[PDB]
Amino acid sequence: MAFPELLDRVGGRGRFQLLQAVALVTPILWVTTQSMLENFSAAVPHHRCWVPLLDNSTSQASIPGDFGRDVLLAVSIPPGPDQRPHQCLRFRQPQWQLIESNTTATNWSDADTEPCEDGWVYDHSTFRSTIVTTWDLVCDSQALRPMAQSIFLAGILVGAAVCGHASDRFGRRRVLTWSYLLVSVSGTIAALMPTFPLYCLFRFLVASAVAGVMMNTASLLMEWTSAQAGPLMMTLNALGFSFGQVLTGSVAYGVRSWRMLQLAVSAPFFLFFVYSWWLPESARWLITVGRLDQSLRELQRVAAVNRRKAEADTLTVEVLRSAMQEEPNGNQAGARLGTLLHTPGLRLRTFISMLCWFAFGFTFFGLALDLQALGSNIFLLQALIGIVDLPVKMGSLLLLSRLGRRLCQASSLVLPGLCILANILVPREMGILRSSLAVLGLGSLGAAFTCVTIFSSELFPTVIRMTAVGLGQVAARGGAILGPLVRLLGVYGSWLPLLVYGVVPVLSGLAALLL
Numbered sequence: 460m461a462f463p464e465l466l467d468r469v470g471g472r473g474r475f476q477l478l479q480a481v482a483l484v485t486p487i488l489w490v491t492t493q494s495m496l497e498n499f500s501a502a503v504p505h506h507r508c509w510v511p512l513l514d515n516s517t518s519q520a521s522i523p524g525d526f527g528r529d530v531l532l533a534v535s536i537p538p539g540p541d542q543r544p545h546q547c548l549r550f551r552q553p554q555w556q557l558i559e560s561n562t563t564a565t566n567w568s569d570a571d572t573e574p575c576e577d578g579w580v581y582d583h584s585t586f587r588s589t590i591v592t593t594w595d596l597v598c599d600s601q602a603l604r605p606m607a608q609s610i611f612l613a614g615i616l617v618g619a620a621v622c623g624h625a626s627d628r629f630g631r632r633r634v635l636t637w638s639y640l641l642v643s644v645s646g647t648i649a650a651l652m653p654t655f656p657l658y659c660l661f662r663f664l665v666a667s668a669v670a671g672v673m674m675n676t677a678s679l680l681m682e683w684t685s686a687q688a689g690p691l692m693m694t695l696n697a698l699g700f701s702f703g704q705v706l707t708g709s710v711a712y713g714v715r716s717w718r719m720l721q722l723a724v725s726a727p728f729f730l731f732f733v734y735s736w737w738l739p740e741s742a743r744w745l746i747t748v749g750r751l752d753q754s755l756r757e758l759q760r761v762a763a764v765n766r767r768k769a770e771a772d773t774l775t776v777e778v779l780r781s782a783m784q785e786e787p788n789g790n791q792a793g794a795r796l797g798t799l800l801h802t803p804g805l806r807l808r809t810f811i812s813m814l815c816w817f818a819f820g821f822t823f824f825g826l827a828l829d830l831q832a833l834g835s836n837i838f839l840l841q842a843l844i845g846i847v848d849l850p851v852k853m854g855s856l857l858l859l860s861r862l863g864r865r866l867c868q869a870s871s872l873v874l875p876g877l878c879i880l881a882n883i884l885v886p887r888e889m890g891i892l893r894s895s896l897a898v899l900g901l902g903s904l905g906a907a908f909t910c911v912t913i914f915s916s917e918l919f920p921t922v923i924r925m926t927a928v929g930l931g932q933v934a935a936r937g938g939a940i941l942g943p944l945v946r947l948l949g950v951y952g953s954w955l956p957l958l959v960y961g962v963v964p965v966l967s968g969l970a971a972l973l974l
């Protein structure tokens with residue numbers, strides 16, 4: 460007797476599945492919050508060079524003449540390109556000549572200015588303090604935020620790999636609960652460190668544990684149900700992320716100091732760890748290893764939950780042993796990576812599939828972590844990304860049946876791509892339309908992820924199917940690391956980052972219909 464018959468006589472759609480779906484989807488919201496917090500915990504508020512005559516009340520008490528604050532600001536700080544005071548320069552000697560309008564204040568050499576040797580002054584209109592304010596990553600080290608985000612994503616990658624191996628060797632629920640605890644502890648410790656490298660290291664560990672819990676949640680959610688309702692489980696696991704975006708919006712609107720926000724986001728994972736003990740472990744994996752009694756215990760439990768004790772009373776050890784004998788082998792795992800490239804018919808089916816996976820990690824994270832520039836109100840913008848995602852996410856599954864197979868993937872990438880290209884041409888005065896085009900861009904990229912998981916399976920044969928979706932996972936992560944690093948090239952122009960981020964999916968999507 461095979462395992463599906465046992466899962467059939469125990470219950471696949473019973474209430475137990477609903478309870479487990481709720482209890483495992485709820486933490487996905489907070490995982491999304493931890494992943495997206497870098498948009499609010501490290502914002503860049505306005506800044507100007509520290510001034511002796513403006514800031515120090517000692518010199519403020521000795522000022523000859525009661526001039527307006529705008530006058531003093533014009534005297535101390537040269538103007539900038541946006542008619543605002545310059546952000547990294549200061550007049551070395553108070554220039555009183557600038558007051559007279561008879562002299563056109565335009566011939567100022569950089570030799571008359573000096574770098575800010577007395578710190579900076581930030582505005583506290585909407586943010587009380589962020590790490591940009593705390594450690595002054597401005598005007599010389601402004602390239603240290605993409606470094607932090609790249610470190611976070613590298614942490615996700617390494618943690619995913621290590622936790623995958625460990626969960627294959629140890630179990631699902633064990634690695635799940637220990638990853639919960641690791642997220643909680645590492646977040647708590649990261650919310651109090653005094654210097655920057657320690658903050659980076661503990662963000663690394665947080666991301667590793669988050670990758671672990673995400674993968675194990677996916678596996679456990681898919682495994683304990685029948686093959687009929689799998690895609691519904693994947694759909695719920697996808698909706699978790701959008702609801703997490705909305706939660707991030709609300710929570711960030713709540714708290715404005717990066718330490719308290721970080722603690723509030725990292726707290727409830729201990730509560731999740733505290734109740735992760737009552738969930739029954741996966742029985743199929745236990746059958747694979749060979750601990751039959753444990754599997755029978757878990758099966759009797761889950762059957763007793765669904766009010767199906769009578770039929771499960773017949774379960775015995777020998778039928779589980781025969782099921783183990785019917786379990787397939789994974790010895791061939793070594794040569795699957797080779798034959799994916801060796802056979803010509805399978806070479807091209809991969810080189811296109813990865814560019815579908817790589818284009819998502821590169822375009823999404825390169826923008827969704829820079830919501831400061833693509834609009835004005837961050838709290839409302841962060842919320843709309845999650846709200847719009849659901850209509851597109853539900854609509855895309857409808858479009859599958861009507862427009863066909865090949866035309867689904869190609870369509871769900873050109874549309875998010877062309878909106879980013881149109882961002883530069885739209886005049887800077889029309890701020891409303893510039894923001895609305897950004898939301899539809901980042902929002903529609905949610906359904907782009909849902910489709911590639913579905914189309915990954917039907918392309919490759921079932922023998923090597925697990926391997927192909929595996930490599931698609933690495934190219935998606937390995938591309939995310941190169942996401943934020945692109946924003947370094949903004950020094951050449953403010954439009955160039957918006958050019959690279961949108962051309963990649965269009966060149967990916969239009970090339971995906973060739974399958």
Ligand SMILES: CC(C)(Sc1ccncc1-c1ccc(C#N)c2ccccc12)C(=O)O
Nearest residue numbers: 490491494615697700820905908909935936
């Ligand atoms: C899962 C990752 C590593 S990305 C990621 C990293 C950290 N935390 C959440 C996500 C994430 C994954 C799939 C999503 C989808 N759809 C999604 C949607 C919104 C927000 C986050 C994600 C990937 O590249 O596969």
